[PDB]
Design a protein around this ligand. Structure first.
Ligand SMILES: CSC[C@H]1O[C@H](O)[C@H](O)[C@@H]1O
Ligand SMILES: CSC[C@H]1O[C@H](O)[C@H](O)[C@@H]1O
Ligand SMILES: Nc1ncnc2[nH]cnc12
Ligand SMILES: Nc1ncnc2[nH]cnc12
Lengths: 234, 232
């Protein structure tokens, strides 16, 4: 009864459903980001709409941490599926997060790793578990694994193949997860990514994203709502 | 007036950290902020770490806490403009991401949704920097600086930047992130960095050889600029 859960989403459509569910909501506007406070099923939450990309997410994650001091962070939104058994709508939960577009290999850093940072960032084990519990209880299809981020919308061709080559175990790709993980790592705050698949990152990813965002928002949202419930009670 | 200064590597901010008097260190979000005076001018120097997220994070803490009036981003860079040479100075007219790509939806290459395609550095700050470059007889170039989370070492990487930004004068890894954050906070900025390599196949070796040189030059520039900004 005194846990505050931070939730971060990039686009308005990706956070709109959850924003409308917040009881006693209030709006805080800062650094070009918006933070909704209130409760979601009796649980105190702080929902930030960050904007797209690594820097936007970092700026927002920093404002959320520094200002709302949430206990854990859940990054939601959509993603391009890379793992074979993923279909539009299915859930992906992060085990870990890595930048697919960071490269200081010229200095002997592991591909994806930035100097001063670990090669990848680990999601909180308990958060991952509660998320798997929800996945099982809602009976949805999900895959747990490495999620990779970059400042590009993958659309097949070279972009896609480079990622597949460098991160064969990557189960999905998007644009904010690793930045949020990087910031939480610095603030020593537990995180977990729970996203719904909107496309498969090929030549059709753009059209698929357009046709299925409502579906990904709904599916990811249901999971987040359920995860907050699960986390604060069980 | 308080001038905020951001640099990535310790080696890149240590000379400046040393001259700060009435010095205090604040440790937060895994970044260090050194507040005090640099030759009579109030400053806040942040060692951010390498890359866009590291810089965005550091910049946000700096702005949201020390509330500087302007931001000076320093450090080094890979020369792209034909006349640049190790030690030379590049000044930002503007900064753009060379690795952001959401063109699949119609944004300009390098542009992220919700942001202008590029971020303009402050005219006054640019003018002051040019006056210092002139007063110190330094060889410098002004123009577009492109940032990315990759160290450029010729080959395909360099080719991609030549192709999307034939006009870029230099490449590095934090500038646009800092510009982006200053944008959201309405804080003017300017980038002043020294060339440590020319981003070719030997950039790694050259970065290694001229580490110190870069640090000294960029530092000298920053001290002069701070001074000019605060006392004419
Ligand atoms: C419109 S670019 C794709 C967006 O959806 C996912 O959440 C990505 O991370 C990005 O925010
Ligand atoms: C060690 S990778 C190159 C570094 O020097 C420049 O300042 C870049 O921005 C990065 O911080
Ligand atoms: N294909 C893709 N690339 C990047 N971010 C995405 N988010 C959802 N689909 C994506
Ligand atoms: N070649 C290069 N690429 C990226 N950042 C740099 N900083 C200095 N040289 C660089």
């Amino acid at each position: 009864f005194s846990m505050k859960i931070g939730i971060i989403g990039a686009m308005e459509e990706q956070v709109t459903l959850l924003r409308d569910k917040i009881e006693n909501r209030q709006t805080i506007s800062l650094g070009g980001c918006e933070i909704y406070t209130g409760q979601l099923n009796g649980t105190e939450v702080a929902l930030l709409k960050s904007g797209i990309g690594k820097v936007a997410a970092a700026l927002g994650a920093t404002l959320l941490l520094e200002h709302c001091k949430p206990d854990v962070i859940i990054n939601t939104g959509s993603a391009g599926g890379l793992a074979p058994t993923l279909k539009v709508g299915d859930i992906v939960v992060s085990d870990e997060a890595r930048y697919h577009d960071a490269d200081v290999t010229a200095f002997g850093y592991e591909y994806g790793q930035l100097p001063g940072c670990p090669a990848g960032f680990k999601a909180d084990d308990k958060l991952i578990a509660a998320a798997e519990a929800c996945i099982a209880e809602l009976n949805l299809n999900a895959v747990r694994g490495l999620i990779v981020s970059g400042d590009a919308f993958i659309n097949g061709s070279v972009g896609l193949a480079k990622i597949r080559h460098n991160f064969p175990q990557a189960i999905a790709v998007e644009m904010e997860a690793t930045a949020i993980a990087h910031v939480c790592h610095n603030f020593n705050v537990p995180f977990v990514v729970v996203r719904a698949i909107s496309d498969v990152a090929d030549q059709q990813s753009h059209l698929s994203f357009d046709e299925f965002l409502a579906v990904a928002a709904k599916q990811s949202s249901l999971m987040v709502e359920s995860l907050v419930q699960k986390l604060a009670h069980g």
